[PDB]
Design a protein around this motif. Structure first.
Motif, PDB file in Angstrom:
ATOM      1  N   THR B  97       0.889  -1.208  -0.054  1.00 44.55           N
ATOM      2  CA  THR B  97      -0.026   0.198   0.164  1.00 44.55           C
ATOM      3  C   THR B  97       0.879   1.178  -0.159  1.00 44.55           C
ATOM      4  O   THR B  97       0.465   2.092  -0.763  1.00 44.55           O
ATOM      5  CB  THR B  97      -0.852   0.126   1.244  1.00 44.55           C
ATOM      6  OG1 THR B  97      -1.531  -1.258   1.372  1.00 44.55           O
ATOM      7  CG2 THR B  97      -1.923   1.124   0.987  1.00 44.55           C
ATOM      8  N   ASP B 149      -7.042  -1.426  -5.650  1.00 41.49           N
ATOM      9  CA  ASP B 149      -6.387  -1.730  -4.231  1.00 41.49           C
ATOM     10  C   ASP B 149      -7.024  -2.984  -4.161  1.00 41.49           C
ATOM     11  O   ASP B 149      -8.457  -3.233  -4.459  1.00 41.49           O
ATOM     12  CB  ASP B 149      -6.429  -0.796  -3.188  1.00 41.49           C
ATOM     13  CG  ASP B 149      -5.642  -1.063  -2.199  1.00 41.49           C
ATOM     14  OD1 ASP B 149      -4.728  -2.111  -2.394  1.00 41.49           O
ATOM     15  OD2 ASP B 149      -5.462  -0.393  -1.174  1.00 41.49           O
ATOM     16  N   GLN B 150      -6.546  -4.244  -3.525  1.00 38.56           N
ATOM     17  CA  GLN B 150      -6.883  -5.415  -3.363  1.00 38.56           C
ATOM     18  C   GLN B 150      -7.659  -5.833  -4.453  1.00 38.56           C
ATOM     19  O   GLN B 150      -8.713  -6.349  -4.499  1.00 38.56           O
ATOM     20  CB  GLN B 150      -7.958  -5.297  -2.088  1.00 38.56           C
ATOM     21  CG  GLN B 150      -7.138  -4.995  -0.868  1.00 38.56           C
ATOM     22  CD  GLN B 150      -6.082  -6.003  -0.533  1.00 38.56           C
ATOM     23  OE1 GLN B 150      -6.267  -6.983  -0.872  1.00 38.56           O
ATOM     24  NE2 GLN B 150      -5.246  -5.569   0.336  1.00 38.56           N
TER      25      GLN B 150
ATOM     26  N   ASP C 171      -7.053   0.298   5.133  1.00 39.98           N
ATOM     27  CA  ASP C 171      -5.353   0.531   5.109  1.00 39.98           C
ATOM     28  C   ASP C 171      -5.186   0.816   3.750  1.00 39.98           C
ATOM     29  O   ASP C 171      -4.250  -0.021   3.320  1.00 39.98           O
ATOM     30  CB  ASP C 171      -4.744  -0.681   5.727  1.00 39.98           C
ATOM     31  CG  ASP C 171      -3.458   0.023   6.374  1.00 39.98           C
ATOM     32  OD1 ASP C 171      -3.360   1.165   6.451  1.00 39.98           O
ATOM     33  OD2 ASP C 171      -2.737  -1.110   6.357  1.00 39.98           O
TER      34      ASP C 171
END
Ligand SMILES: Nc1ncnc2c1ncn2[C@@H]1O[C@H](COP(=O)(O)OP(=O)(O)OP(=O)(O)O)[C@@H](O)[C@H]1O
Ligand SMILES: Nc1ncnc2c1ncn2[C@@H]1O[C@H](COP(=O)(O)OP(=O)(O)OP(=O)(O)O)[C@@H](O)[C@H]1O
Ligand SMILES: Nc1ncnc2c1ncn2[C@@H]1O[C@H](COP(=O)(O)OP(=O)(O)OP(=O)(O)O)[C@@H](O)[C@H]1O
Ligand SMILES: Nc1ncnc2c1ncn2[C@@H]1O[C@H](COP(=O)(O)OP(=O)(O)OP(=O)(O)O)[C@@H](O)[C@H]1O
Ligand SMILES: Nc1ncnc2c1ncn2[C@@H]1O[C@H](COP(=O)(O)OP(=O)(O)OP(=O)(O)O)[C@@H](O)[C@H]1O
Ligand SMILES: Nc1ncnc2c1ncn2[C@@H]1O[C@H](COP(=O)(O)OP(=O)(O)OP(=O)(O)O)[C@@H](O)[C@H]1O
Ligand SMILES: [Mg+2]
Ligand SMILES: [Mg+2]
Ligand SMILES: [Mg+2]
Ligand SMILES: [Mg+2]
Ligand SMILES: [Mg+2]
Ligand SMILES: [Mg+2]
Lengths: 294, 292, 282, 294, 293, 292
Positions: B97, B149-150, C171
Motif C-alpha cells: 500500500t 487496491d486489493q 488501510d
C-alpha cells in the motif's frame, strides 16, 4: 458525449472515403452509436508479419476466413465456398488471438467492427436489443464486414433461467440476428475467447469456424522470439536464441514479450545510466539466461 | 453533492499541474471516474518513508516509473517502454500500500486509485460504461496509473456461476487492458495479498509482478529505523539490531505496532505530566513486549 | 433525523456537513452514549485491561493534541476484542460508546449486505466516508469474525468484493483520518490474516480468574442488599471453576430469585447470603 | 426512422398486391411499426426441398399446422379440425428449426410475421404493451397469419416476482392476446426455441403443437448430407457418402454444413490457387474423412 | 384512432340499445377510451354449457357472484347479501378461467369491461391514473358492471420501492378506487390469474371472492372430454371415453383440447386426403396411440 | 361538464353547511380540488359501524378530532392543538378506510379525499399548482382534513432516479405541509398499508400515527358483532365467541366475506323462493366454511 459524435462523424467519413459505395446509405441513431465503435486498419500497428509462430494458422485463417469473405466472385463457382457465419479464436492466454483480430482489421478489407459490452448493454429497457439489431443492420449495410466481440465468453455464457431479463433477451436477439430467417448478407462474426467451455452450445453452434490458438511449441516459440526482437540490435556470436526459445517451458507469447522487455532493459542498463548523467548492448544470452531459470 | 465538488477540485488540480489537458472534455462516467483520482499532495508516504525494500524500489523505478514517465529517454528501442500492468503481491503488511502511495507521490503519472464502490453499479450496463470511461480517461491523461487496491477480488477465478454483470465487467476490463485499441502509455498497477485467486488471463496481462515478501533481518532493521524517525531514541541503553532480528517473521505493520505500543510505554510519563496540566526509546519497552 | 440532530447538538462543528443517501443509512446505525447503561464502573475484573484500553485506544484517539509531540503516539487503526464467551467484550464496547466521546458506529450485517448489485460496497464506502466526516469515530462490527472470515475462492462475489472494499478503506491509500475500527469477536482464528494484520491492537479478554471473578461478583451484586455475617463472597467467587462473567450473572439472578422467594409469594398474595449460591453451584 | 417508413410502405404495398382483399384496412402507428417486421416468401431462399432428414416432421407440420390454417373451408366439416393456437419448434441446436420457420414463410401463404425483441420492448412506459396489442390486432387484420418470435424462450421465461414490471406486464399482454376472451381469428403463434424448459408453464400450455426437432439419426444425417451437397459436383466411385453420414456421431445439421464447407474448400484448393495465379475436384471421401475423425 | 373511434361509437350505441336507461349519461375522453375496451355477449362464443367439469364451481359462481350482482332487489332483504368487491379466478394453467370470464360476459348481464395493460399504461405523465379513474367512473355509470383485468398478477404484483413511479401510483389509484371512501356502486372487479402468490396482500385482501379453478379430476376430465367432443361424430362400440378421461394423468383442459384436435385430424386423415385432391367415428385408436397412458 | 357540475354541487353544499364560506372565491385549480371534496352525507360508515377499535377510536377523538374541531376548548395551552398530519398504517383490511369514512362522517372538518388522478397532470408544472391550490383551499376551508388514500405511493422513498415532476411534486407537498404547522388548522390524514415505503421526511411531518393492526380475540368478537347487525341470528344453536376466536389471523374484511358467504348459505332457501324469513344465522354455516 460530443466525443462520441466526433468519433461517429470521423469513422463515417473515413468509411465513405475508402469505400465510395456507402455514400447513399443513411443510418438510424442506434446504427450511428454502433458506427462509433468501428476500427479501421490505419489505427492498428499489427500485421501478419508481426504475428509469429502461427503460419499454418495464418494460412488457414486466410483460406477459410478472409478470402471466402473478401473475394466472393472468386468463390462464386460453388454455393458452399462462401464465408462462415462466425469465427471463434479460442485458446490459452497470451497466444496471439488479439493480434489475430488486429491483423484481421489490418489486412482484410472488411469493415471491422470491434465492440464491447459498454456499447451494447444500456440502462434503459429495450435499448440494448435495439443496439444489437442496429449493429447487425449496419453490418448488412457495410456488406463486407467483421463484427468482433472481444472476450466473447462473457457475452455468450451458458444460458440459465436465473439470468437477467435484458441479458437473456439480448442473447436471443444476438443469436437470432446471427442464424435467423433474415440471414446476414456476407457478415462474419469473429470472436476471441479464452475459455471455450463457458460459451453456450447454441452460440458455439453458430460460431462454426473455430481455431485453437494454443500454447507455442519449440518452433512457435522460436518464431515468436524472432518476431519480437526485430528493430532491436542483437549479437553475432555470444547470442544463441534457439536454446532460449526451447528453455521457455510452457511460456505464452506475452510471457516471452515481458521477458524480452526485461532483458532489453537489463542490456540497455548503461543507456539508462548515460541518459541519467546526460549504444545499446547487443542483446546476447546473458540477460535472458540470468532471468529465465532453465 | 460532494461528488461534484470532488470532480471539480480534482479536475482543476489536474489542469493546473499539467496545462496540456485543458482542451479535453469528458463524458459523465469519465467525470465519475475523475472523482477517484489521487494527487501526490494528499499522500504523506515517500520512498524515504519505505524501508527494507531498496532493491525492490530500484527495480520498481527502472522497470515501472521511468519506462512510463520518461518515454523519449526510452525511445531508442521499441521494447523499452512501460508494462501493460504491474502487480504487487505478497504476505500481509509488507509495504504494498505504501508502494502505491509513493507511486502516487514520486511518479508524475495521473494516479487513479479506484475501488469497487465506484465501479459496480446497480443499473444494467452502467458498470461496463464506468470501466470504459475509466480507461478512456486514462488514455486522455496520457501518463497514467490505474490502481485497483486489493485487486484479487476484482480479478477472481472466472466461473460459469459468476454474476452476469460481474462476468461482463471482467471481460470489459480485460479487453481494455489488452484488446485491439491498445492503451496509450497506460499502466495498470494492482496490489494483492493472494496472487493465486487471480485469474490466469488477468495475471497474464499483469506481467510486471513484484514479490513484496516478509522482511528479513536487513529489511526488519531498515523498517525499524524508518519507523522510528521523528522520535527520540537512546544512546547506549538501546540496541536496535537484536530487536530487528528478534521479531521473527513479523511483518512491517506488526513492527509498526510494537513500535507504537513501546512509544506509549516510554512516554507514559509524558501523558502523566499532561494529566496534571518524552523518554528515550530504549530496549526495555521492546524487550518486555516482544517475547523473543 | 434523530441521530443526526443529536450528533449536531453534542458536537456543533458538524453542521456544515452534507451527506449522501448511503451515508444517511449508515447514520441510521450510530449509537450515542445516552442509550447505553454500562460504564467502566459497571465492568469488573478487567481493571488492567481497562487501563490499557484507555492508554492505547481512547486517549490516543480522543485527545490528539496531547499526543502531537511524537508522530508514533496516535490511535490504533483498529482494535480487536477477542476471547472466550461471556468475558465482557460487549460491555467493553458499550462503555467505549459511553466514556469515549468518539461518534460511535455500531453496525451489523443487516445494514451492510444488500440484495442489489454493488449497493453493499457503496454502503461500506459511505460508512467510512461518514467516519472520516465524524472525525473522532469508532466503527464497531459486533461479532466481527463472520465478516472477516478466511477468504476463499468459493466465496460469494458480493461478499468477496465487500471484504476487499472494507480492507481497502481500512488501510488503503487515502488514510482514515483518526478513524478506529473496533471489533469484538469470540473466535480470533476464523479472522483472515490480512484483516487481523490491520486490526492489530488486540486484547485478550480471557476467562476470569479467582480475583477477577471476585470483582465481577461484587460489581454485579450492587443495588442489591447483601448479608453481614452469613455471607462470604470470596469462597463463592473462586468456587466458580471456569465460569464466565455471564455465567456468574445468571447464577446471581437465580439466587436473587431464590432469596426473594418470599417477595414473590407476598406479591402473589432477603439478605443475599451463602445459602442460595452454595445450594446452586455444586 | 425514414428507412423504417420505407420498409413499412414496401411491406404494405407488397401485402396488398399479393392479397387484394386487404386494401380497405388501415392501421394505427404501432400496427405500422409491427408491419415493418413482416417477412414475405420472396426474400427467403429455403424451401421444403431445402430441408432434409425431417420428412415425417414436414408432413406432420403440413397436416397439423399449414393446412388447418391455410385452407379452413376444407376443414369446416368439423369444429375441432382448425388451426392450433400456437406451435413450438424445440430441440437441440442446429437441427433445422429456423429453416422450418423459413420454409413456413415460403410455402405457407400466411402473412408471416417474424419479430424480435428490438421491435417489441421500448424505452417509454406502456409503449411495448401497445406494440404487442398492435401486433395481434394486425395479425387479426391479416386473417391468415403466423406470428414468429425467434428464440422464444427468452420472451417466455419462467415468470417471477423479481421480473421487471414492463417485462411482466408485457408477458401478461402477450398471453392475454394468445388465449384471452377476444380470441384470435385464425392467428397462429409459431415459435422456435432451443431450451423448452425455460418456457413458463402457462406460455407452454397455450403453445400446444410442439415438435421435437431432435439431433439427426443415420437416415436423417444421410438426407441432410445429400440435401446440402446439391449444386456441387460429386464423385462417382471414390465417394461413399453413407459411411460419412453415419460417421458423424451426434453432429447437428449445421455441424454437417460447416464440415461440408471446409471439405468443399479443401477440394477446391486448386481452384483457389488457379484464381490466385489467374475444375472443382469431385467431392470424394478424402476431404470429409481426413477432417472428421471417425 | 379512427378505428378506435369507430369501436367507441359501436360499443356505445350497442350499450345504449341493450340498456336504454344510459342515454342521458355522457363521458369524458378517458372514459371513452375505456369504453373502447368493453366486451358485449354477442362477440363471445362460450357459455356455461360450453364449460365442463366445473359445475359446483359454476353454481358457486352464480350464487355468490352473478345473482348478488345482477339481481339486487332479490337480495335487498339483508344488507350482507350483496355483490363482492372483487372476484379472483386462480389456478393451474388451462383449467377454464378464461372461459369462466367469457361466460361471465355471456350469461351475466353486467356491462363487462375486459381491459389489458395496453389500454391502461400510457407514455405521458399522469395519463394512466386518469385512465384508471375514468375506468371506475364508467363502471359506476354502467351500474351493473364487471371490470376484468386478464392475467391480473402482473398488474397486482408485490409492491416494492424498486417499482416505477407511475406503476406505483397506478397501483395506488387502482386500490383506492377498489376500496376507498367513494365506494363503487355495484361494481365488481373480476380477475383471472395463474399465480396467486405474486399478487400483493392488499390487492388480494380486496379480492375476497377467490375460486380455485384447479386441475381437473377424473369426473372433471370426463365432463371436459364430453363437452369438447360435441358437434363431432363419435363411435358406438369401439370408443370408450372413460378410460381416456382417467388416463390423462394431470392433463389440463387445454391439453385435452389439443389432444382431441390431434386425434380429430388423425381420424379425418381420409377426409383430408379426399378434400385436398365424411369423417371416421372418433374411436379409441387415435387417443390411445397418442397419449401414452 | 361533469367536473363543473360536481364543483358547483360540492361548493353550494359547502356554503350551505358552513355559511362563513360565501365571501371566499377560488382560482381554477382550487376549483378542480373542490371537485374532490367528500361531505358526510355520501358516506354510510360511522363510529358505531367500526368495531374492535374502541381504544383507537377514543385516541383518534382525543388527539385528532377535538384538537382540530374545537380549538377554543384547547386554547388554554399552545401545545394542545391539532397535529400537522395523521397516518393510519397497518396490515390490510383492519379498518383504516372506514376510519377515514367516519372521520368524514363525525368530524365536521371539510374533508378532502383526493387521489393521484386529480393531482398528477400531463402538462408541465400543472400538478405543483394543483398541490398549492389544494393546500390553499384547505387554508380557506379552515377546519379541514386532506386525505390521500394509499399514501405510500405518493410518499415513496425519494431517489435521484425519480421523475422530475414527481420529485418537485413531492417537494411542493412537503413544503406545504411544513408550511401549515396548524397555522391554517389543516390536518393531513393519510392511510397506508406499508409504512416502510414512506420517506423519512414525509413520515416525520406525519407524527400522529396509529397502528390499525390485525384484530385480536376481543377485536374479532366486536367486529363480528358489528357486521352481523340488521341480520337475524339464532338464540341457542349459535355461539359467536367460538367463531370469533376461531378465525386465526383473519382481517376485518376476511370476516366480512366469510359473513357474506354464510349469509348466502343460510338464505339459500329464501333465495330459491325469491327466484321463483332468512334462516337464523347459526354456527353451521360459519363452522362448515372456516376450517378451525
Ligand atoms: N504468436 C505471437 N507472435 C508474436 N507475439 C505474440 C504472439 N502471441 C502473443 N504475443 C505478444 O503478446 C502480446 C499480447 O498477446 P495477445 O493478447 O494477442 O494474445 P491473446 O491470446 O489474445 O491473449 P489473451 O488470451 O490473454 O487475450 C502482444 O503484444 C504480443 O507482442
Ligand atoms: N517496508 C516497510 N517499511 C516501512 N514501514 C512499513 C513497511 N511495510 C509496512 N510498514 C508499516 O505498515 C503499515 C501498513 O503496511 P502496508 O499496508 O503498506 O503493507 P501491505 O503489504 O500493503 O499489506 P496489505 O496489502 O495487507 O495492506 C504502514 O503504515 C507502515 O507504517
Ligand atoms: N467482566 C465483567 N464484569 C461484569 N459483568 C460481566 C463481565 N463479563 C460479563 N458480564 C455479564 O455478562 C453479560 C454479557 O457479557 P458480554 O456479552 O459482555 O461478554 P462477551 O465476552 O462480549 O460475550 P459474547 O462475545 O459472547 O457476546 C453482561 O450483561 C454482564 O452483566
Ligand atoms: N435438417 C436440415 N437439413 C438441411 N440442412 C440443415 C438442417 N438442419 C440444419 N441445417 C443447416 O444448418 C444451418 C442452420 O440450421 P438452423 O439454424 O435452421 O438450425 P436450428 O434447429 O434452427 O438451430 P438453432 O435454433 O440453434 O438455430 C442451415 O443453414 C442449414 O444449412
Ligand atoms: N373446464 C373446461 N371445460 C371445457 N374446456 C376447457 C376447460 N378448461 C379448458 N378448456 C379448453 O382449454 C382452452 C383454454 O382454456 P382457458 O384458457 O379457459 O383456461 P385457463 O385456466 O384460463 O388457462 P390459463 O390458466 O393458461 O390462462 C379452451 O379453449 C377450452 O376449449
Ligand atoms: N374494524 C372493523 N370493524 C368492522 N368492519 C371492518 C373492520 N375492518 C374491516 N372491516 C370490513 O372490511 C371492509 C374494508 O376494510 P378497510 O378497507 O376499512 O380496511 P383497511 O385497514 O383500510 O385495509 P386497506 O388499507 O387494505 O383498505 C369494510 O367493508 C368492513 O366491513
Ligand atoms: Mg485479449
Ligand atoms: Mg493494501
Ligand atoms: Mg458478544
Ligand atoms: Mg435459430
Ligand atoms: Mg387466461
Ligand atoms: Mg385504504
Amino acid at each position: 458525449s460530443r466525443e462520441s459524435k466526433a468519433k461517429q462523424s470521423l469513422q463515417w467519413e473515413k468509411l465513405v472515403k475508402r469505400s465510395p459505395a456507402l455514400a447513399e446509405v443513411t443510418l438510424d441513431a442506434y446504427e450511428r452509436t454502433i458506427l462509433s465503435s468501428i476500427v479501421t486498419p490505419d489505427e492498428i500497428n499489427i500485421t501478419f508479419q508481426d504475428i509469429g509462430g502461427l503460419d499454418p494458422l495464418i494460412s488457414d485463417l486466410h483460406e477459410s476466413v478472409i478470402y471466402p469473405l473478401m473475394m466472393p466472385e472468386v468463390y462464386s463457382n460453388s454455393p458452399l465456398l462462401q464465408a462462415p457465419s462466425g469465427v471463434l479464436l479460442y485458446g490459452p492466454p497470451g497466444c496471439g488471438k488479439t493480434m489475430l483480430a488486429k491483423a484481421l482489421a489490418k489486412e482484410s478489407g472488411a469493415n471491422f467492427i470491434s465492440i464491447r459490452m459498454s456499447s451494447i448493454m444500456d440502462k434503459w429497457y429495450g435499448e440494448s436489443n435495439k443496439i444489437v439489431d442496429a449493429m447487425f443492420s449496419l453490418a448488412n449495410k457495410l456488406q463486407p464486414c467483421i463484427i468482433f466481440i472481444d472476450q466473447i465468453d462473457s457475452f455468450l455464457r451458458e444460458r440459465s433461467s436465473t439470468d437477467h431479463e435484458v441479458t437473456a433477451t439480448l442473447k436471443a436477439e444476438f443469436m437470432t440476428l446471427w442464424d435467423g430467417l433474415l440471414n446476414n448478407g456476407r457478415v462474419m462474426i469473429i470472436g476471441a475467447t479464452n475459455r471455450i467451455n463457458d460459451i453456450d452450445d447454441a452460440f458455439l453452434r453458430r460460431l462454426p469456424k473455430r481455431f485453437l490458438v494454443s500454447l507455442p511449441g519449440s518452433d512457435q516459440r522460436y518464431k515468436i522470439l524472432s518476431v519480437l526482437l526485430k528493430d532491436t540490435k542483437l549479437d553475432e556470436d555470444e547470442f544463441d536464441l534457439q536454446l532460449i526459445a526451447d528453455n521457455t517451458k510452457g511460456f505464452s507469447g506475452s510471457d516471452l514479450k515481458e521477458l524480452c522487455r526485461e532483458a532489453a532493459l537489463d542490456a540497455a542498463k548503461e543507456y539508462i545510466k548515460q541518459k541519467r548523467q546526460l549504444k545499446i548492448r547487443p542483446l546476447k544470452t546473458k540477460d535472458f539466461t540470468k532471468k529465465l531459470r532453465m
